[PDB]
Amino acid sequence: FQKVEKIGEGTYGVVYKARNKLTGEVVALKKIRLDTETEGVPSTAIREISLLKELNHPNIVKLLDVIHTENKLYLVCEFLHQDLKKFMDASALTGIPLPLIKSYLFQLLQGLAFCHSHRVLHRDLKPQNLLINTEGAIKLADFVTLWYRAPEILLGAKYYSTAVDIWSLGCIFAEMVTRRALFPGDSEIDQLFRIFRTLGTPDEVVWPGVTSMPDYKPSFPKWARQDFSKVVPPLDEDGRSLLSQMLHYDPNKRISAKAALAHPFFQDVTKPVPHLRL
Numbered sequence: 001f002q003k004v005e006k007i008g009e010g011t012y013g014v015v016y017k018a019r020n021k022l023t024g025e026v027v028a029l030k031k032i033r034l035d036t037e038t039e040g041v042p043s044t045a046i047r048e049i050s051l052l053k054e055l056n057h058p059n060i061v062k063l064l065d066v067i068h069t070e071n072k073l074y075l076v077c078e079f080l081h082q083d084l085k086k087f088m089d090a091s092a093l094t095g096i097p098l099p100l101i102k103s104y105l106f107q108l109l110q111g112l113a114f115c116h117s118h119r120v121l122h123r124d125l126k127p128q129n130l131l132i133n134t135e136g137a138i139k140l141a142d143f144v145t146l147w148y149r150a151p152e153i154l155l156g157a158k159y160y161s162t163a164v165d166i167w168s169l170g171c172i173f174a175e176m177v178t179r180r181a182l183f184p185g186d187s188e189i190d191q192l193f194r195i196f197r198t199l200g201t202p203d204e205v206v207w208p209g210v211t212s213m214p215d216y217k218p219s220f221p222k223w224a225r226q227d228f229s230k231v232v233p234p235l236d237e238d239g240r241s242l243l244s245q246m247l248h249y250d251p252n253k254r255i256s257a258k259a260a261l262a263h264p265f266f267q268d269v270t271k272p273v274p275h276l277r278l
């Protein structure tokens with residue numbers, strides 16, 4: 001295995017496309033600088049990470065191997081050619097076809113239903129972690145980030161649930177439809193305010209228990225909720241109906257991935273292929 005292209009860089013480290021010179025096998029290799037002063041990887045970290053290696057689903061990017069030294073953690077994952085962020089950039093003018101948004105959302109909910117039923121939460125879902133191929137598949141990888149963060153997390157809940165992934169996916173769904181991020185916060189308060197201005201300022205009625213959240217403030221400005229026809233033009237009523245349930249404030253009223261799969265939005269789901277130029 002040999003580095004053939006750099007496909008990502010950030011504060012975490014770097015991701016390469018790597019090719020086996022003999023077999024042609026291609027993998028994604030994510031190289032992570034530990035900064036633990038030669039102590040290696042926290043046992044918690046590797047155990048959490050190693051648990052991910054158990055996820056075996058066609059809509060989850062397979063964690064193939066973990067390799068770590070005193071200095072570095074290397075994750076080796078299955079490789080796919082493009083991410084959803086890149087694709088939505090490339091589809092800025094005409095948008096992603098609705099049948100393809102439909103297919104991708106159905107596929108991602110199958111993957112989350114699997115993870116969630118095996119007690120695993122992604123917690124950092126975003127368009128950049130969603131990978132696509134020229135076969136019409138989309139898969140969850142990497143198990144601002146702000147823009148997709150559930151309100152219970154922004155308000156400081158100590159324990160969060162699988163419902164935080166549904167929220168993120170709902171923001172991604174909206175973004176595929178409108179070709180702009182739904183809640184593009186310029187600060188952590190702006191993030192909240194952007195949510196409140198769309199869904200309404202939460203209170204104990206709409207969200208029982210919101211008042212116990214560490215960051216909850218009675219002094220929040222009071223906005224009224226907007227109709228979803230304004231939030232996601234021009235998605236049909238089936239789509240908006242599903243989107244609304246994925247974006248409920250109360251993580252207990254938020255739709256589950258298994259329930260979302262039965263929604264009538266998916267009645268006419270098929271498998272289009274996108275046109276990519278690699």
Ligand SMILES: *CCC(=O)Nc1ccc(-c2ncccn2)cc1
Pocket residue numbers: 007008015028030061062063075076077078079080081082083128131141142143
């Ligand atoms: C599974 C570990 C991991 O981080 N994997 C991963 C795979 C793929 C990418 C990627 N691939 C193509 C384009 C953009 N990003 C990042 C990380």
